């Protein structure tokens, strides 16, 4: 099992072994989201970390047959079970490494989509009936193990949208929809939540919230650009 709680991450690997770069990635990530001043903009992520509600996994690109998408599919099935028990506000953070000096943002985004595609082959459940399977559909979302997920890519190549620089690796952030229960967009609590996060972004990032955050074409939110560019709705790369 490559699904880890905070206390388990140190045993992922040591030195040049598979996952040997993971402990440091984990520390860098926790430093970013627990930072005092300015605070990390998403206080939900900070709270989740503080409360022990974040789990972690990794992909080691050097060893795709043993530390790659097949194993991550197992980790994600295990995570999904965990995420529906106990606290609603859990996240899985998946580091993809080793880090690649000099990678550009478009490169990390390509790697992200390729990984999502590779996972589809290892899904043991049918695609959910409530979500269209066609990625050009306005209501498409990425699904796995029987349900849609919220997922986004973090990268060190986010220079202006620093909120999405979580350390030196391409980093995937996975959540089941349960996380958002009680903070839907129409709700009083949901409007408060978005206010608070956005106020945080305005003290942290060099660029404001992206227009695609605002329902349709959620895929564009997975791989925000570092600027105000807006991708074509029917151009999801999956």
Ligand X SMILES: NC(=[NH2+])NCCC[C@H](N)C(=O)O
- Token pair listed for 234: 């029917």
| 152 lines the binding site for ligand X (CB under 6 A) | yes
Gap between the Cα atoms of 127 and 133, Å rounded? 7
For residues 46, 50, 54, 57, the Cα torsion angle rounded to the nearest 10 degrees is: 100
Residue 111's binding partner out of ligand X, ligand HEM, none, with CB under 5 to 8 Å set by partner kind: none
The number of residues that bind ligand X (CB under 6 A) is 6
- What's the longest Cα–Cα distance across the chain? 49
Residue 179's binding partner out of ligand HEM, ligand X, none, with CB under 5 to 8 Å set by partner kind: ligand HEM
Residues ≥6 apart with Cβ < 8 Å to 84? 176, 178
Of 156, 137, 160, which Cα lies nearest the Cα of 148? 137
Residue 116's binding partner out of ligand HEM, ligand X, none, with CB under 5 to 8 Å set by partner kind: none
Residue from 197, 223, 225, 236 in contact with ligand HEM (CB under 6 A): 197
Residue from 150, 178, 207, 233 in contact with ligand X (CB under 6 A): 150
| 225 lines the binding site for ligand HEM (CB under 6 A) | no
| 218 lines the binding site for ligand X (CB under 6 A) | yes
Residues 114-143, one symbol each (x = binds ligand HEM by CB under 6 A, - = not), give: ------------------------------
List Cα–Cα distances, 35 to 39, 40, 74, in angstroms: 6, 6, 32
Exposed / middle / buried, residue 65 (Cβ in 10 Å: 0-12, 13-18, 19+) = exposed
Residue from 23, 180, 233, 238 in contact with ligand X (CB under 6 A): 180
Residue 119's binding partner out of ligand X, ligand HEM, none, with CB under 5 to 8 Å set by partner kind: none
Stretch that binds ligand X, among 12-20, 92-100, 213-221, 227-235 (CB under 6 A): 213-221
Q: How far is the CB of 150 from ligand X (least distance, A)?
A: 5
Gap between the Cα atoms of 161 and 155, Å rounded? 10
Closer to ligand HEM by CB, 26 or 89: give it: 89
Exposed / middle / buried, residue 93 (Cβ in 10 Å: 0-12, 13-18, 19+) = buried
Residue from 116, 193, 225, 236 in contact with ligand HEM (CB under 6 A): 193
Phi and psi dihedrals of 50, rounded to 5?
-55, -35
Residues in the chain: 238
**Residues lying near ligand X in the complex (CB under 6 A):** 150, 152, 180, 213, 218, 221
**Residues lying near ligand HEM in the complex (CB under 6 A):** 33, 41-42, 44-45, 48, 54, 89, 91, 93, 152, 163-164, 173, 179-180, 183, 193-194, 197-198, 213, 221, 224
């Amino acid at each position: 099992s490559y699904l880890w709680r905070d206390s388990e991450v140190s045993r992922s690997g040591s030195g040049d072994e598979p996952f040997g770069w993971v402990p440091e990635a984990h520390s860098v990530f926790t430093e970013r989201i627990l930072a005092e001043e300015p605070p990390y903009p998403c206080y939900f992520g900070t709270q989740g970390q503080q409360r022990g509600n974040n789990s972690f996994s990794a992909v080691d690109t050097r060893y795709p047959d043993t530390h790659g998408p097949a194993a991550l599919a197992r980790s994600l099935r295990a995570y999904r079970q965990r995420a529906w028990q106990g606290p609603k506000r859990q996240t899985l953070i998946v580091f993809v490494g080793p880090a690649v000096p000099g990678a550009e943002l478009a490169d990390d985004h390509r790697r992200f989509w390729t990984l999502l595609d590779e996972l589809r082959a290892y899904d043991t459940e049918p695609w959910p009936a409530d979500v269209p399977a066609d990625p050009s559909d306005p209501r498409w979302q990425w699904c796995f193990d029987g349900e849609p997920w919220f997922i986004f890519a973090a990268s060190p190549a986010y220079k202006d949208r620093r909120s999405r620089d979580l350390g030196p690796c391409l980093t995937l952030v996975f959540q089941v929809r349960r996380v958002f229960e009680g903070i839907g967009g129409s709700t009083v609590a949901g409007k408060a939540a978005r206010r608070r996060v956005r106020e945080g972004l305005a003290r942290y990032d060099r660029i404001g919230p992206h227009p695609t955050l605002g329902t349709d074409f959620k895929w564009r939110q997975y791989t925000l650009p570092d600027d105000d560019s807006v991708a074509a709705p029917d151009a999801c790369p999956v």
